[PDB]
Write a protein that binds this ligand. Sequence first.
Ligand SMILES: Cn1cc(-c2cn3nccc3c(-c3cnn(C4(CC#N)CN(CC(F)(F)F)C4)c3)n2)cn1
Length: 283
Amino acid sequence: PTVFHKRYLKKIRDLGEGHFGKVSLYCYDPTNDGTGEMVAVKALKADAGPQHRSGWKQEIDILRTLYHEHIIKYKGCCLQLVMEYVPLGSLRDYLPRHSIGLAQLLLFAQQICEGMAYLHSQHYIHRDLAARNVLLDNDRLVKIGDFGLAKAVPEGHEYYRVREDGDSPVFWYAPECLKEYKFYYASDVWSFGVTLYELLTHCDSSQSPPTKFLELIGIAQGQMTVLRLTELLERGERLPRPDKCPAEVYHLMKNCWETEASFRPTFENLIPILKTVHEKYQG
Ligand SMILES: Cn1cc(-c2cn3nccc3c(-c3cnn(C4(CC#N)CN(CC(F)(F)F)C4)c3)n2)cn1
């Protein structure tokens, strides 16, 4: 509802970009003095089609109505999406550069669950839960930073019917997404399991989910990369145990990766469990 005037928005640097989105850092200086507040501004790339353009207002309305300590703060519009600047950036860019302890990773893991549990309680599915969409406020504060794929689950259904795209993050997806094209709340849990794997590997590119699943599938599979991913997943093949990752944390990852969606923990279930595991490694 807040209206930011384009003239006061002074671009500083580009922060990140997706297939049809771009996020840039701006100083909103109506004067020109030190008061100039730092804002993150998200806009639609020129190439975006009318499907992604129509679902952009819907994105803006999702973040508009989400108020949670582990969800990026919405500021207003100028359409361009004005949000808070989350100082240390994505975990994907941060972790390969800063060696963070196991205890802190488990703490970040917990906060992702609280934001995710809150999101699910508002009847929304994220569909893009990955380390790149989790922003670092400080060494003890994390936030879900992008909702480009987020969708409301229709009232009388337990899943959203997904429209098989090219920009879909298939290496973060559960088999029911890849095979039946249904996105359950339990499908975000599968992705959290992947995100936890990313945190535990410090977002190292050589150990990333696409790197690991392609070493298994092969890089010359024609139109069959998704199909071969589905069959290895249904054969019970999973990402390896991140080196130094606790055995119990791995079993919790593996349990987020149950082939049967119903056998997976909810985000609510995960919070008491991660709080305990964190407390354990905090000592
Ligand atoms: C020191 N330092 C701070 C930052 C910083 C701060 N903020 N504050 C808000 C957003 C960001 C980001 C940022 C970087 N990538 N992203 C995305 C994924 C997500 N969250 C959005 N995606 C782009 C599109 F699709 F939305 F357009 C990528 C966001 N980076 C980077 N280095």
